[PDB]
Design a protein around this ligand. Structure first.
Ligand SMILES: CC(C)CCC[C@@H](C)[C@H]1CC[C@H]2[C@@H]3CC=C4C[C@@H](O)CC[C@]4(C)[C@H]3CC[C@]12C
Lengths: 34, 121, 37, 113, 105, 30, 29, 118
């Protein structure tokens, strides 16, 4: 059970990363359009 | 009165008892001497601390007792029962011990974002 | 529980794929930005 | 026994697998995958492998003072990478691929310069 | 005295020939039957310094037995390979976001 | 009863966020 | 033992962002 | 020499005895004869239906008929936990899905980029 809760933390980290990178892409695309 | 302390970090486990602060202390585990053998690097004592490397759930998990010289094996009236299922480099954290760090990271990211946004103005 | 492990390891790979898509999109747009400037 | 010394420790809840071969002698040499892999000393008789979640495999061998013994080829399938695609996992992956591709394509479309 | 810490399928028990007195730690769930005590489930990690009296052969003397349990199930087996990469790439991601904000303005 | 309701709720929320961001950035440009 | 709770954690955070951006849009619509 | 080969697909555990193909061979599981009434019964091929982690798991030794088994080559230990239609992702499968994902993303973005200039 010490490894089931490790993937449940890596998934949180990956979702956090995706939420950051989608904002990065959105902001840079908004800049590029201008 | 006299308390007991035990610290488990990853795999190694360290025990200590302050019952006899003025005398270095020998130990037992189900009536066998484990304190002082100048071998078996998996174990080994100190002035007060005793370290048990490669701790196992099904073995050396019993009635530990700390006793100095001039003390009968049954002379000590304070015992301990330990059952630890340890693994290699594993700790304990609940939901509120990861919520705080995730919120801290979000807050610091927002703070840096606002700092760099105001800097352009 | 086994079901929790199944769902968790299902979501991990999907989010990794989405992250890879985002990274490749960022590479494309940063190449475009460098070309523009 | 019939000349089969190597066994596997059972009745354990800790996530670890061990070995056991009985040879009433001293310097009971150990082996793994046929080739020489180690030794054995006093106060311990059980070679260890680690967590079963890493799926130990391969042929294992032990030898006391007798000749070449016979193996105990061990197979484990603690999956731990166990995506279940039956009715609500392939559809989710398909939807997450399709909508992400569409949202990427719209953004690429809206780059004209 | 060695107080037998009896273990059920998933529950632990403290057994002494005379009523058990709790001093420091967890008092658990006291069974209505005398001379028995249900600390709790084996997975909740009970602990605490207790005290009972003499057994069926060794009356009129009293001692204590500290009880400790670390049968953790909320534990996490984290490796420095993935947990460090996550932090490093999160740092690079927030640096990228900060750089992107400057471009917006 | 909620093995995948987590990610099902998360998926819709991301979509709504992206859609509402798309409209917002438009008005900002004016 | 930890997964179901961490669901609502990230699900709520993005919901806050969505609501905040909705308010920002409705103040400029 | 020859190890013991096992292949599992969902709840269908398949293993064979790649020791004596042309022969007659029987089975046990933890020193208990297994086969014939489910359970697969071939001279080398065998199937575990309804495999369980804690009730079919032990020493699979495979003897020819008429030969007591303690003289065989060796044994097997199997502690497989089964699924209901789940896939084991090795290092190859994740790599191939990642490669096809990035290829299908690139080949679809570069199509609309050419369409952007129209
Ligand atoms: C995976 C994601 C990040 C891909 C990109 C999706 C989002 C961020 C894209 C798709 C449509 C885009 C919008 C399309 C049109 C306009 C109008 C223009 O005058 C300003 C930029 C603006 C408002 C764009 C901002 C970025 C945008 C909202």
């Amino acid at each position: 059970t010490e490894k089931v809760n490790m993937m449940s933390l890596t998934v949180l980290g990956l979702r956090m990363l995706f939420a950051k990178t989608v904002a990065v892409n959105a902001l840079l695309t908004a800049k590029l359009a201008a | 009165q006299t308390p007991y302390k035990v610290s488990i970090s990853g795999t190694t486990v360290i025990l200590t008892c302050p019952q006899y602060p003025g005398s270095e202390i020998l130990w037992q585990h189900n009536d066998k001497n484990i304190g002082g053998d100048e071998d078996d690097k998996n174990i080994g004592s100190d002035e007060d601390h005793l370290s048990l490397k490669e701790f196992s759930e099904l073995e050396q998990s019993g009635y530990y007792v700390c006793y100095p010289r001039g003390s009968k094996p049954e002379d000590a009236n304070f015992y301990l029962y330990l059952r630890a299922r340890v693994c290699e480099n594993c700790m304990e954290m609940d939901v509120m011990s990861v919520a705080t760090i995730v919120i801290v990271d979000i807050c610091i990211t927002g703070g840096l974002l606002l700092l760099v946004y105001y800097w352009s103005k | 529980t086994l079901l929790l492990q199944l769902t968790n390891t299902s979501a991990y790979y999907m989010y990794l794929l989405l992250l890879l898509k985002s990274v490749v999109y960022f590479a494309i747009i940063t190449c475009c930005l460098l070309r523009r400037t | 026994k019939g000349n089969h010394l190597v066994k596997v420790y059972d009745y354990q809840e800790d996530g670890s697998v061990l070995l056991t071969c009985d040879a009433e002698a001293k310097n009971i040499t150990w082996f793994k995958d046929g080739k020489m892999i180690g030794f054995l000393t006093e106060d311990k008789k059980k070679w260890n492998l680690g967590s079963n979640a890493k799926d130990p495999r391969g042929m294992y061998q032990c030898k006391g003072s007798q000749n070449k013994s016979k193996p105990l080829q061990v197979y484990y399938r603690m999956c731990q990478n166990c995506i279940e695609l039956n009715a609500a996992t392939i559809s989710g992956f398909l939807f997450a691929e399709i909508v992400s591709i569409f949202v990427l394509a719209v953004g690429v479309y809206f780059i004209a310069g | 005295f060695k107080i037998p810490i009896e273990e059920l399928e998933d529950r632990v028990f403290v057994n002494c020939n005379t009523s058990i007195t709790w001093v420091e730690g967890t008092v658990g769930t006291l069974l209505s039957d005398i001379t028995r005590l249900d600390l709790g489930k084996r997975i909740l990690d009970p602990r605490g310094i207790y005290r009972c009296n003499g057994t069926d052969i060794y009356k009129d003397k009293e001692s204590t037995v500290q009880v400790h349990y670390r049968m953790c199930q909320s534990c996490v087996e984290l490796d420095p390979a993935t947990v460090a990469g996550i932090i490093v790439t999160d740092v690079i991601a927030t640096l990228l976001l900060a750089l992107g904000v400057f471009c917006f303005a | 009863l909620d093995p995948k309701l987590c990610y099902l709720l998360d998926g819709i929320l991301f979509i709504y966020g992206v859609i509402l961001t798309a409209l917002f950035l438009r008005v900002k440009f004016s």
